[PDB]
Design a protein around this nucleic acid. Sequence first.
RNA 1: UAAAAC
RNA 2: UUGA
RNA 3: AGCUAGUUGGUGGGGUAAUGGCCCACCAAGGCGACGACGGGUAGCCGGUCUGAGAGGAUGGCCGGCCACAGGGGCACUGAGACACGGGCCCCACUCCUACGGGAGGCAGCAGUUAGGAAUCUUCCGCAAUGGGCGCAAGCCUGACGGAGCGACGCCGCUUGGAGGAAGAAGCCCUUCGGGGUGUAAACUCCUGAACCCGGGACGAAACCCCCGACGAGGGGACUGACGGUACCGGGGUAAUAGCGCCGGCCAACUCCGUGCCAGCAGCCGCGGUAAUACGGAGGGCGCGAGCGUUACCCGGAUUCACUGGGCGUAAAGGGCGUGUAGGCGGCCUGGGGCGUCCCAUGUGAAAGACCACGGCUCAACCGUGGGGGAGCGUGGGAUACGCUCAGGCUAGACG
Lengths: 83, 138, 104, 99, 124, 208
Amino acid sequence: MVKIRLARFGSKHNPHYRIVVTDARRKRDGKYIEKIGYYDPRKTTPDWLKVDVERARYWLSVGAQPTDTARRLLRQAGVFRQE
Amino acid sequence: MLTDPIADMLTRIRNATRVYKESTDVPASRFKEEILRILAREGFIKGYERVDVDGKPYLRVYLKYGPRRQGPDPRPEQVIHHIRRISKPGRRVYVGVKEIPRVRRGLGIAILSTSKGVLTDREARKLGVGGELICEVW
Amino acid sequence: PKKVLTGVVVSDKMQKTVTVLVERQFPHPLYGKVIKRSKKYLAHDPEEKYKLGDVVEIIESRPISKRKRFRVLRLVESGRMDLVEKYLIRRQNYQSLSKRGGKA
Amino acid sequence: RNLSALKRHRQSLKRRLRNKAKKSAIKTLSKKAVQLAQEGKAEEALKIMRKAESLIDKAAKGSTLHKNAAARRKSRLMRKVRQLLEAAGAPLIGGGLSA
Amino acid sequence: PTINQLVRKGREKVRKKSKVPALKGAPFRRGVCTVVRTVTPKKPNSALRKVAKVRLTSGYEVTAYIPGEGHNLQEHSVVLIRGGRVKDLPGVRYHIVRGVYDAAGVKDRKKSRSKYGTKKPKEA
Amino acid sequence: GRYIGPVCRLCRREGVKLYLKGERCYSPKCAMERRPYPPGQHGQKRARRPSDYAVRLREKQKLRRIYGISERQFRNLFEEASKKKGVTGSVFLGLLESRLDNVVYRLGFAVSRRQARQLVRHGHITVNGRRVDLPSYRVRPGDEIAVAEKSRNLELIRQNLEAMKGRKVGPWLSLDVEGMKGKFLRLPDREDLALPVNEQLVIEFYSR
RNA sequence: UAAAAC
RNA sequence: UUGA
RNA sequence: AGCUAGUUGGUGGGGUAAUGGCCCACCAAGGCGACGACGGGUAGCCGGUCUGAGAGGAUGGCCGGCCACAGGGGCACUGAGACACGGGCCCCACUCCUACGGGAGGCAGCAGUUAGGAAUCUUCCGCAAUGGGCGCAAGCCUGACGGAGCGACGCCGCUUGGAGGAAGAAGCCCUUCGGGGUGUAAACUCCUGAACCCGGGACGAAACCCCCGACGAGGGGACUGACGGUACCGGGGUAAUAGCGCCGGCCAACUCCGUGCCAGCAGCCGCGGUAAUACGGAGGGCGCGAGCGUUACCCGGAUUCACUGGGCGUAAAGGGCGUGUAGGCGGCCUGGGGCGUCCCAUGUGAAAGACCACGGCUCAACCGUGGGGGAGCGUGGGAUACGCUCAGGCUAGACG
Ligand SMILES: [K+]
Ligand SMILES: [K+]
Ligand SMILES: [K+]
Ligand SMILES: [K+]
Ligand SMILES: [K+]
Ligand SMILES: [K+]
Ligand SMILES: [K+]
Ligand SMILES: [K+]
Ligand SMILES: [K+]
Ligand SMILES: [K+]
Ligand SMILES: [K+]
Ligand SMILES: [K+]
Ligand SMILES: [K+]
Ligand SMILES: [K+]
Ligand SMILES: [K+]
Ligand SMILES: [K+]
Ligand SMILES: [K+]
Ligand SMILES: [K+]
Ligand SMILES: [K+]
Ligand SMILES: [K+]
Ligand SMILES: [K+]
Ligand SMILES: [K+]
Ligand SMILES: [K+]
Ligand SMILES: [Mg+2]
Ligand SMILES: [Mg+2]
Ligand SMILES: [Mg+2]
Ligand SMILES: [Mg+2]
Ligand SMILES: [Mg+2]
Ligand SMILES: [Mg+2]
Ligand SMILES: [Mg+2]
Ligand SMILES: [Mg+2]
Ligand SMILES: [Mg+2]
Ligand SMILES: [Mg+2]
Ligand SMILES: [Mg+2]
Ligand SMILES: [Mg+2]
Ligand SMILES: [Mg+2]
Ligand SMILES: [Mg+2]
Ligand SMILES: [Mg+2]
Ligand SMILES: [Mg+2]
Ligand SMILES: [Mg+2]
Ligand SMILES: [Mg+2]
Ligand SMILES: [Mg+2]
Ligand SMILES: [Mg+2]
Ligand SMILES: [Mg+2]
Ligand SMILES: [Mg+2]
Ligand SMILES: [Mg+2]
Ligand SMILES: [Mg+2]
Ligand SMILES: [Mg+2]
Ligand SMILES: [Mg+2]
Ligand SMILES: [Mg+2]
Ligand SMILES: [Mg+2]
Ligand SMILES: [Mg+2]
Ligand SMILES: [Mg+2]
Ligand SMILES: [Mg+2]
Ligand SMILES: [Mg+2]
Ligand SMILES: [Mg+2]
Ligand SMILES: [Mg+2]
Ligand SMILES: [Mg+2]
Ligand SMILES: [Mg+2]
Ligand SMILES: [Mg+2]
Ligand SMILES: [Mg+2]
Ligand SMILES: [Mg+2]
Ligand SMILES: [Mg+2]
Ligand SMILES: [Mg+2]
Ligand SMILES: [Mg+2]
Ligand SMILES: [Mg+2]
Ligand SMILES: [Mg+2]
Ligand SMILES: [Mg+2]
Ligand SMILES: [Mg+2]
Ligand SMILES: [Mg+2]
Ligand SMILES: [Mg+2]
Ligand SMILES: [Mg+2]
Ligand SMILES: [Mg+2]
Ligand SMILES: [Mg+2]
Ligand SMILES: [Mg+2]
Ligand SMILES: [Mg+2]
Ligand SMILES: [Mg+2]
Ligand SMILES: [Mg+2]
Ligand SMILES: [Mg+2]
Ligand SMILES: [Mg+2]
Ligand SMILES: [Mg+2]
Ligand SMILES: [Mg+2]
Ligand SMILES: [Mg+2]
Ligand SMILES: [Mg+2]
Ligand SMILES: [Zn+2]
């Protein structure tokens, strides 16, 4: 099953992930299907978390299953807010 | 039979000017005539005109030269210091508009044959088209 | 889109199968000179409809056999052995190229 | 040593036998049917033909055949049968074959 | 050649023959000495250059120069070959590495020391 | 890193006066004053016509030796200057000149470059109030270069920053002799600098 | 004349 | 005879 | 230089998820090759990487994509998926157990051993983070991974001190024996203060879960750190690693002594046979600096395989001559076509890398974000000068 998860791209002690849509079976830093955001856990800049809400919503609409950490970040960015 | 009339012409010219001829005849063809026009307009030759030798169509090509000169060897400078053939039967050279070259930083020309007629690298560039790079003159 | 090619039927000694000779032209990658290479395709002809000398269109098809992966789309121009000739001859010169014998 | 998931093998051997047995039956009946038809015995040629159809589809319920594999067999069967019959005629029992 | 010609035969690439069949192009090859002769220079030279026949690990047997003032290489001395011909003694195309294995460095060498494997002398 | 050795012998080799000492380089006690000729056992013999190479070399050696930078760092800077848009020669100088260890020298906090270097290392310097002890740190326009408060009261910073009163500061820089802080106004234009060096030769040396 | 050689 |  | 029998095609079957000589009967006699078949050699391919002004040459380690393999050969079973590295069967080679009948095993997983080699590391910490499998969940497994360790192997940053100091110690080296050099270099004077010692001490970690709410949206609460008492902040605080190559020309840097075609140097040209800037040492000097040299290999310079960009009278190079096949090349005018060619739009050209910009670690290396590139190929539309093709015409080529 396809997933919305984090791919490590930073560097030693300098982790920067990419919120990605990749098949579940792929290596993590492998070939993903689409990038839909990024995440700097050490929030080293005012922009430490962006997410293409429209896109995330798209994939969720077709099966994509988020990691419990990706779900958390996707939420923080209002992917699930339905007000 | 000539294997390449266009080169034949550029040479007849190259040769005629190297001995400061006044004119020079070359068997006619629309295409040849077409190149002469470019040649005229750019001011490389004085001009040309249709004539008949032995009853067959030719093209007198009135050449141009600089003025007489000083010191040993008064022979004038050439208006055509250069005239080479690019495309040749059995090795045609075609270029895209972004591929048209610039002869001597512009002080020279390049005659291309495009599907919009025969034109200089500037004209061709302007109309935004490429074609067969015929020759370069400077 | 399924690829379409045009060529000459240079053989039909096969049941429901003709040999189409297709040619192509391209600028030599380093030398520029336009060079002309050519290849033979075994196209499918279920009705023995096409004959030697026929210029036809061939179309990328689903396998009919090992080797056969094309079907005759349509006849572009009837008879003209002038082309078939070149072929037969070029193949006939092969005789005079070994350690045996052939024709000049 | 000892990788407890030898159990997978242990099981494959059972499933193997379970399949091998379902197919052995399918084949035998398929023939039986084809043979009966090949002799004009339409009445029973179909009767048996239906068991075969049923057995095939059941085999496809699980891993045995499953898929278009079944379809293929049912197809080639009713095909051969209907034909061998229409070489004597009279589609009696009109079991599986339609109209 | 005409273009048609270049299109038919094309240009042929220049291949390069090695000067060091130290095999595997390896930077160095280890071997054991056979003889520890001496040779006569050619062209217009004269002296007793110190050479050494060596049976390499690379299944080879070749003569190799022994640079430096003097060595300590007997017959079964373990040596390291490094490649570098010697314009004078045709046949010698490698050098023994003074300072590695059985070939001791050079004594009293105070200048070009890294070559000639000589540790830095203490001074005070 | 860095040279660290007799520096006046470098002036004598390049035959020009380099100020690797600040004071003394002005005093007639300078070595370029005493024996203004190449160091060593031959400094007084007739210098043979230098080869086109020798010239480009010596010239570049001069410029590099002026900033006490390593041929390594010195080259990387030049290659960076080459890539960038604009007269490589100028850009190069602007870059060598944007080195904190140098800017500190330009603002007179230090009397020499070798000294300003140590000031930076020992943290005595600051950039925009944040500490920086990297001589190679690149000062950009707008940055303010000051002195660590904890340092303001230092027997040395006294003289240097005191003797700076009534002293002019390069056009691309502004100095506040009171608050012990200066500001990098803009990249020095080739003409703002007056170095006994012809960059063309340098650009040509790395050309070879 | 340095040597190879006598 | 060699070498320069 | 000729290759081919399942060989090429057909009909009917078999087989698979599915096309197909994939396989099998029967039938035809085909298929392929100088546009290089067949054979031999070598080799995982690519994004890219190194180099180059470019064209090009060389290359495919790390990272990402595809392929193949899992001691060697063959085979199938199970399953959505395998012909299955840590599953199965047989043959082979080997190793181990053997009560001699017979059994057990496969590190091209992490770490480690041994062998081979010029040469390549820790039998480490952790499951905290990311990702994966199973589970409703708690949670369990994870040598994938996140970290630390070793090696200047590479890249980047940094230190071995800063300022003042003699018309200039001693020592050592030259000397016209007057003096010149090492050299402000040293000793000294003052200043700062790497190392080190104390104190504080982190981001990376908010989810899963619990409560409210509807097991959702939303809100609230709790646990959790291997790296690590590390980074970093603050206080105190010592003046404290320098080496390596080179100095005849190319090539930056010169003198004395020693040696006497010797000992030796040497990349090429070459140097040494009594006064050698070329051998060795010393003083001095040049280069570079935690490195500097060497060897090996790639590109460059090499327009020295020349497409860009070469040549063949005497330098290497015109075939002994002709006839002629294939192929390459093709006079003048008109028309159709629109293959080559050119143009517009569009799709594709992953990520990383490369380029530009802004930004995060004090800088940088490194890294994040954003932008711009892009040949090639597919699709639709268009142009028609030149090349091609078709049709007609011409007589200046050719022939009669
Ligand atoms: K869906
Ligand atoms: K044949
Ligand atoms: K079962
Ligand atoms: K100021
Ligand atoms: K078939
Ligand atoms: K082959
Ligand atoms: K490149
Ligand atoms: K080019
Ligand atoms: K290549
Ligand atoms: K390749
Ligand atoms: K490549
Ligand atoms: K909630
Ligand atoms: K401190
Ligand atoms: K000290
Ligand atoms: K002597
Ligand atoms: K001499
Ligand atoms: K010497
Ligand atoms: K010497
Ligand atoms: K080369
Ligand atoms: K000849
Ligand atoms: K001959
Ligand atoms: K396109
Ligand atoms: K037309
Ligand atoms: Mg949300
Ligand atoms: Mg036929
Ligand atoms: Mg083709
Ligand atoms: Mg049975
Ligand atoms: Mg199933
Ligand atoms: Mg000699
Ligand atoms: Mg060598
Ligand atoms: Mg302090
Ligand atoms: Mg045959
Ligand atoms: Mg079939
Ligand atoms: Mg089928
Ligand atoms: Mg077959
Ligand atoms: Mg082969
Ligand atoms: Mg291989
Ligand atoms: Mg080149
Ligand atoms: Mg480049
Ligand atoms: Mg390239
Ligand atoms: Mg890879
Ligand atoms: Mg093995
Ligand atoms: Mg199955
Ligand atoms: Mg397995
Ligand atoms: Mg294993
Ligand atoms: Mg060993
Ligand atoms: Mg974990
Ligand atoms: Mg997890
Ligand atoms: Mg002394
Ligand atoms: Mg000092
Ligand atoms: Mg103190
Ligand atoms: Mg947990
Ligand atoms: Mg509850
Ligand atoms: Mg509830
Ligand atoms: Mg919540
Ligand atoms: Mg020199
Ligand atoms: Mg003597
Ligand atoms: Mg001796
Ligand atoms: Mg030497
Ligand atoms: Mg001497
Ligand atoms: Mg010298
Ligand atoms: Mg030398
Ligand atoms: Mg170069
Ligand atoms: Mg080349
Ligand atoms: Mg030549
Ligand atoms: Mg001759
Ligand atoms: Mg000759
Ligand atoms: Mg001849
Ligand atoms: Mg012909
Ligand atoms: Mg024509
Ligand atoms: Mg033709
Ligand atoms: Mg027309
Ligand atoms: Mg036409
Ligand atoms: Mg077209
Ligand atoms: Mg495109
Ligand atoms: Mg990309
Ligand atoms: Mg920054
Ligand atoms: Mg990017
Ligand atoms: Mg383009
Ligand atoms: Mg198109
Ligand atoms: Mg189109
Ligand atoms: Mg038209
Ligand atoms: Mg005609
Ligand atoms: Mg005749
Ligand atoms: Zn000075």
